[PDB]
Design a protein around this ligand. Structure first.
Ligand SMILES: COc1ccc(-c2ccc(Sc3ccccc3[C@H](CCC(=O)O)C(=O)O)cc2)cc1
Ligand SMILES: [Ca+2]
Ligand SMILES: [Ca+2]
Ligand SMILES: [Ca+2]
Ligand SMILES: [Zn+2]
Ligand SMILES: [Zn+2]
Length: 158
C-alpha cells in the first residue's frame, strides 16, 4: 500500500461483530484503541456506517475473503493492511480467538486492535519488547504506548 494516509480525518466501519462480547463493549474497545493513536497524531477517527470507510473492520475465521487465512485458536490473532484504497487500511480479527478484556481468559480486543490500527496507519514492528508494535502479543493493564511507538507514528504524521 502507501506509507501513510494522505488525509487526516480517517473513517472506520465495523462491518460485523463477534458474539464473544456485547456490541457496545466491542465498539468501545475499538474507540479506545483509536483514541490511543489520535491523541498523539493530527489524525481523527470517525465511525461511519458505510462501505466508503477508510478502515473496514471485520471478524472472521480461516479463509475469510482476502487470501490471507487465519489459523484457528491462538497464533495469528488479527491482521491489518497498510494505508491505501480498497482493502488497504482494513483490519480483521480472528474470531477463532476468544475476545475479552484480556485480564482473565482470552485476548484483549483493545490491545490487539491498538496494534492492528498501528499497522493500518503504516507502522511496522518495533524492536522494543515493551512497545505496542512489538511482534509478540502481551497483556498489560498499563499504558500501551512506548516512546518508540510514538516516534514511529510521529515520523509518519508529525
Ligand atoms: C501491549 O503490547 C502488545 C504488543 C503486541 C501485540 C500484538 C501482536 C501481534 C498481534 S497479531 C499477530 C500475531 C502473531 C503473528 C502475526 C500477527 C499479525 C501479522 C499477520 C501477518 O503479517 O500475516 C500482526 O503482527 O499484526 C496482535 C497484537 C499486542 C500488545
Ligand atoms: Ca480500506
Ligand atoms: Ca488465530
Ligand atoms: Ca470468538
Ligand atoms: Zn483478512
Ligand atoms: Zn503486528
Amino acid at each position: 500500500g502507501d506509507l501513510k494516509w494522505h488525509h487526516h480525518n480517517i473513517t472506520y466501519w465495523i462491518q460485523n461483530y463477534s458474539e464473544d462480547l456485547p456490541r457496545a463493549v466491542i465498539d468501545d474497545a475499538f474507540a479506545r484503541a483509536f483514541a490511543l493513536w489520535s491523541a498523539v497524531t493530527p489524525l481523527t477517527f470517525t465511525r461511519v456506517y458505510s462501505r466508503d470507510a477508510d478502515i473496514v473492520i471485520q471478524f472472521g475465521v480461516a479463509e475469510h475473503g482476502d487470501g490471507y487465512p487465519f489459523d484457528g485458536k491462538d497464533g495469528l490473532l488479527a491482521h491489518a493492511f497498510p494505508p491505501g484504497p480498497g482493502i488497504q487500511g482494513d483490519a480483521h480479527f480472528d474470531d477463532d480467538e476468544l475476545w475479552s478484556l484480556g485480564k482473565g481468559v482470552g485476548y484483549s480486543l483493545f490491545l490487539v486492535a491498538a496494534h492492528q490500527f498501528g499497522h493500518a496507519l503504516g507502522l511496522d514492528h518495533s524492536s522494543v519488547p515493551e512497545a505496542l508494535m512489538y511482534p509478540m502479543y502481551r497483556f498489560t493493564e498499563g499504558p500501551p504506548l512506548h516512546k518508540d511507538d510514538v516516534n514511529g507514528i510521529r515520523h509518519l504524521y508529525g
